[PDB]
Amino acid sequence: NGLTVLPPLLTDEMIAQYTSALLAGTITSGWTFGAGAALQIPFAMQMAY
Amino acid sequence: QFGRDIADTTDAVRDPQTLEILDITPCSFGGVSVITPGTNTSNQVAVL
Ligand SMILES: *[C@@H]1O[C@H](CO)[C@@H](O)[C@H](O)[C@H]1NC(C)=O
Ligand SMILES: *[C@@H]1O[C@H](CO)[C@@H](O)[C@H](O)[C@H]1NC(C)=O
């Protein structure tokens, strides 16, 4: 009746590639991927920071 | 004799000469979206 639903720009598969990249940076590099290039650090040491 | 849509439009019918049951599907429609670069850049367009 004249109604429609448009799709989102990012598919749920693209949004899960972003939450994937946010997980992968957070674990491997701490906060440092938000400040600049992702500086790796051991996760046992990141949790001690 | 008829079937109904939520807006009280008709969704199906039984024909009054042959008692077969017909769907009514509305004739195909949609939004036309014109993808365009600036008219400054080109007069070429694509249509979604
Ligand atoms: C239409 O006419 C035919 C005979 O020509 C008949 O069999 C049929 O039952 C008629 N339709 C109705 C609704 O009676
Ligand atoms: C628009 O056209 C002018 C023509 O001189 C050009 O200088 C400008 O770069 C164009 N801009 C874009 C966004 O197409």
Side-chain angles (χ1 to χ4, degrees), chain B:
Chain B
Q1 174 57 57
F2 308 134
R4 278 286 222 267
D5 187 23
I6 309 300
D8 288 352
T9 86
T10 48
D11 172 72
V13 300
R14 177 164 57 95
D15 163 322
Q17 301 194 351
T18 168
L19 308 188
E20 67 197 71
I21 318 305
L22 309 178
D23 283 313
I24 294 153
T25 306
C27 292
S28 188
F29 70 93
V32 180
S33 270
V34 184
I35 287 75
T36 182
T39 56
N40 195 90
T41 314
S42 184
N43 292 299
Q44 181 159 2
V45 301
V47 184
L48 178 76

Side-chain angles (χ1 to χ4, degrees), chain A:
Chain A
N1 294 287
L3 282 66
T4 61
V5 171
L6 310 180
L9 175 59
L10 293 74
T11 60
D12 303 300
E13 203 271 316
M14 289 178 165
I15 297 177
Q17 282 180 47
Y18 278 129
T19 60
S20 171
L22 290 156
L23 260 290
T26 302
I27 294 157
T28 58
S29 75
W31 45 72
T32 72
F33 85 101
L39 311 176
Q40 78 279 1
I41 179 171
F43 189 91
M45 295 188 70
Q46 156 174 342
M47 265 285 283
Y49 289 11

